[PDB]
């Protein structure tokens, strides 16, 4: 009965646009793609006004289907919602195409936020059995990732810029990036005019990303936290400090890991397909400065990056070797 | 450094419309009417997206002038703002006129919320020197308030409904009431079709209004707290428990008195003309269930209603005799 609910908190982007601090993640497994629809419906019914998706997820049509029904029955209006999608590295140089395909899949006229998914460029390998006739993450027979020979990752954002700045184009309300390092953002700020509204990265008490947080705050860029539970197994719920503070604030570990970000001014997009936990996990734990420092200390002592797939290896921040299991044995 | 700011919290009215939990009050003293303009401008630039005013205040023109300048220089868009105004008992049976007069004074095409200011009806006494050619709060030669003899207070709300329900009238987005008791709300619910989105009343640690809170929650009516500091001399700032919790949560007394309401899901509209205080007092104290009960218990043991003018005496809830100063001895 106490407020705010995390669904009731809105942050301001650097272009003056408000974004709900809590959003639903939709990077669901291939066997569960169609379950996205009921999750989005459940989320919005419980008060979510933010849905995060992507061209690469193959969940856009199910996001679109859920929205269509809530529009039709008068549960929601388009302008009430904040919809994010992303351009995958395979279309690094075909942003316009990526956006139109995303909008068609979503059955929408515009998205609120469009991101560069990775600072990466992939080769375009034909495959009828892929996404839009292309291999999502191409490898050779070795099998190592096939990066585009002529690829410049900033070309994606430059094309994002051009759509955002075109006074005759109303397909986006904001642009941003995902998985960018300080170093890459510096190049972007140096070479580009539009300041990304967000940098969507993995962050949570096992990966506080302190230096990135400080940098982004200094440059008017909001972080969006993905995999806040630690992806598969939700290992972050097992952190003793997380359990302790959840008990103290009379909330679930889920609420605590959400609140960890919102408290620090960070947008958070937990992924779930469970309608019950989606509807229930909306409580706020307003953690003290000392509690945040305790949580952040833990992360620096036991760093774990759960999302670190082979394709990300060329990035100085990513190893490509997945998580370090040695730091989970605390 | 920490979030949410109180400017970042949005509640949902029963018609789906979102209202910012924090609003600027504009019932400013007659000597200081013009100072409202800089206060509104300061508020909006600081992050406020909710301005509360009334036909009766004579501050509408200054609210409108502040808004116009912010619209014109691109600081804000109309749809970003939530604007509330109110119908005074002198126009209890002329809601259309009141609304049009407010809209003219504000320089706006619509208000987000239109309230019945009091469950009262005043006689119309001509005075070219008064507001809209009328005495605001008429007293007879004997000095007593001149109520409309044929007056039914609920007629005001019924006129509000008509404007609200009219598919071809876009002057309002929501309606509600102010200074209503449980009993008056019960008659409203029995006789009318539209559930008031809010009931705006004086409430704070000295006047917790526990029973009204429970009723309104059950019937999906949001409370809006006015005079949260306790009017003249801001006496609530001096409550030992308020200073105590303020220090605990690293916030000012002002912030704590705002947070008291927002934590309980109550909209709050502190009135201020101090631009530096308006800008800085946006911090949130996420009070526990125990600390709120401490504050609410204080109000039950030390009840003080600060807003209680002679004109409200005929209402069972009001005495007309102002604050009980004997409950200020602490």
Numbering used by the authors:
A (entry chain B), B (entry chain A): 15 to 344
Task: Show passages lifted from the paper.
Ara1 was subsquently re-annotated as an α,β-dicarbonyl reductase which belongs to the aldo–keto reductase (AKR) family. That is, Ara1 catalyzes the reduction of α,β-dicarbonyl compounds such as methylglyoxal, diacetyl and pentanedione, which are known to be toxic metabolic by-products. Microarray data showed that environmental stresses, including heat shock and oxidative stress, markedly stimulate up-regulation of ara1 transcription in yeast cells. It is suggested that the primary role of Ara1 is to reduce a variety of toxic aldehydes and ketones produced during stress. Here, we determined the first crystal structures of Ara1: in the apo form at 2.10 Å resolution and complexed with the coenzyme NADPH at 2.00 Å resolution.
The asymmetric unit contains a dimer of Ara1 with an interface area of 1030 Å2. Gel-filtration chromatography also indicated the existence of Ara1 as a dimer in solution. The dimeric interface is mainly mediated by strands βA, βB and two loops (Met15–Tyr24 and Lys91–Leu96) in each subunit and contains eight hydrogen bonds and 111 non-bonded contacts, which include hydrophobic interactions and salt bridges. As in other AKR structures, the TIM barrel is mainly composed of eight parallel β-strands, and each β-strand alternates with an α-helix running antiparallel to the strand. The two antiparallel β-strands (βA and βB) at the N-terminus cover the bottom of the barrel. In the apo form, the cofactor-binding pocket and the active site are relatively open and relaxed. Superposition of apo-form Ara1 on the the Ara1–NADPH complex yields an r.m.s.d. of 0.25 Å over 297 Cα atoms. Analysis of the Ara1 structure shows that the three loop regions (A, B and C) exhibit relatively high B factors, and this structural flexibility and plasticity was supposed to be necessary for the recognition of more than one substrate.
